[PDB]
């Protein structure tokens, strides 16, 4: 599938909503949504949101200087192979709210300053219908 | 039609998202989304968002101590009688972003402080499928 990768040169601020609509392929392993602080491979990640169909979990984390932080896991897995989905990633002063379907799923407190984010990437085993930043 | 009215006793903040899904009746005239600062119908309004199918405009305004402020109008009318719609009202530190469909429609600067909001009303000529505060 074609991934999404787009620059946020003015950054994101509290009140930013990333809306992602798509379908999990029937043979999917994992896909990811990253909010990154640079363009180079290995750049710091303010948020890594990683639905894992192969291991029935959704992992949240950050990355600084090449190292992963403490993993946070949401409750259950609100994604199914072969099914469409809608995700909101909502930025506040305190963190990122992940909404899947009709309910908040998990809240990830900021570890890196939000002002460091300047790129969004959506990739892995996912068919994207739309990616929008409001 | 059945309206929505729910309390926000803790107020709202940058990163609050109101997601409204519904259908505009085929003979609709107007409907509204209000963020109010009290429990009475005449309570101050931090946001009054008023799609008007009868006069082909969408009006934004605030109300304080019984008086309306300066009206703001969006570009065109992204609603149609008989059609379903999705609206996001997204709060930032600077204002409310109104998203309709796949695009930001208008940005309305705060006239009232966010901390004063404590009620959300959705009513008028509209059929509501979902009202959520994220
Ligand atoms: O934590 C242990 C779990 O068993 C597993 O989550 C971890 O995997 C990485 O997790 C990263 C996010 O913390 C990121 O997703 C990366 O891509 C993954 O390889 C570990 O490295 C070990 O397997
Ligand atoms: O032609 C534009 C007019 O300015 C018209 O829009 C005004 O309508 C009110 O507008 C309010 C929001 O400003 C709110 O919607 C109220 O319910 C409406 O009666 C009123 O006739 C005069 O103030």
Residue numbers in the entry:
A (entry chain B), B (entry chain A): 2 to 135
Published text:
pmcHuman galectins (GAL) are oligomeric β-galactosidase-binding lectins assembled from small (∼15 kDa) protomeric carbohydrate recognition domains (CRD). Among prototype galectins, galectin-7 (GAL-7) is recognized for its preferential expression profiles in normal epithelial cells. For example, while extracellular GAL-7 can trigger apoptosis of activated T cells following binding to glycoreceptors via its GBS, it can also bind E-cadherin on epithelial cells independently of its GBS. In this work, we studied the impact of homodimer interface mutations on the induction of Jurkat T cell apoptosis, allowing us to positively and negatively modulate the biological activity of GAL-7 by designing a covalent disulfide bridge (G16C) and destabilizing mutation (G16S) to control homodimer strength, stability, and biological activity.
To examine whether these functional changes are rooted in structural perturbations at the molecular level, we solved the X-ray structures of lactose-bound WT GAL-7 and that of variants G16C and G16S in their apo and holo states. This is likely explained by the use of different crystallization techniques, i.e., soaking of WT GAL-7 crystals in lactose solution versus cocrystallization with lactose (present study). In a similar fashion, the ring opening of glucose was previously shown to be catalyzed by the amine group of a nearby lysine in the binding site of human serum albumin. Cα B′-factors between apo and holo WT structures show that chain B is less flexible, while chain A is more flexible in the presence of lactose. This indicates that loop 1 experiences distinct dynamic behavior in each GAL-7 chain upon ligand binding, an observation that was not immediately obvious from a previous GAL-7 dynamic investigation. In the presence of lactose, loop 5 Cα B′-factor values decrease in WT, while conversely increasing in G16X variants.
